[PDB]
């Protein structure tokens, strides 16, 4: 029985200058940064899930025929009741809209709870106290080539994520 979510990527070069710009605009005060590694785009979290519910929500999510599409990366903010600073869209695309409402919506039949969909990428946690928020830097904007379906656990003091599942998007 895991921790389970499905999740979108970022290129290590977008990553990179993702730390380097966090780096740059918040002092370590500011909040604990995410690992440049397990720096993501959540589409649907499934909380934990048994090993037959996992496999049953896997088939589902091979019957997803999405094109891939463009992520660009305009916008950024904080939500303080989550104490969070994040990286966002003004306007997400349309194909990750749709495909997070799928797994949500294939989530949700299955029996795992949900709720509406804000895609966004966390760059620090416990960001109690609200900072000043600047554009991203210029030109991070990538072709979003699959979907990962990943495992979540927690030892020690960290959280780790292992890739399960991957399914491209059609192109």
């Known amino acids: 029985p895991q921790r389970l979510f499905f999740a979108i990527d970022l290129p290590a070069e977008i990553r990179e200058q993702i730390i380097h710009w966090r780096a740059t605009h918040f002092p370590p005060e500011a909040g604990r940064p995410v690992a440049a590694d397990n720096l993501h785009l959540t589409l649907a979290f499934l909380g934990e899930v048994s090993a037959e519910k996992e496999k ?36 997400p695309p349309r194909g990750l809209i ?6 949500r919506s294939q989530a949700a039949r299955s029996g795992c709870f949900q709720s509406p969909f804000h895609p966004h990428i966390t760059l620090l946690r416990d960001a109690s106290e609200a900072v000043t928020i600047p554009p991203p830097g210029f ?11 990943y495992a979540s656990s927690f030892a020690r003091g960290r959280t780790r994520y292992t890739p399960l599942k991957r399914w491209a998007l059609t192109q």
Not at 98 to 103: C, G, V
Not at 139 to 149: K, Q
């Open 56 to 91: 049953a929500l896997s088939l589902l999510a091979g019957r997803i025929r999405q094109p891939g599409f463009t992520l660009t990366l305009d916008d950024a903010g904080q939500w303080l009741r989550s104490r969070v600073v994040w990286l966002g869209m003004r306007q």
């Open 98 to 103: 749709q495909l997070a409402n799928m797994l």
């Open 139 to 149: 030109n991070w904007s990538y072709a979003v080539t699959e979907f990962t379906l």
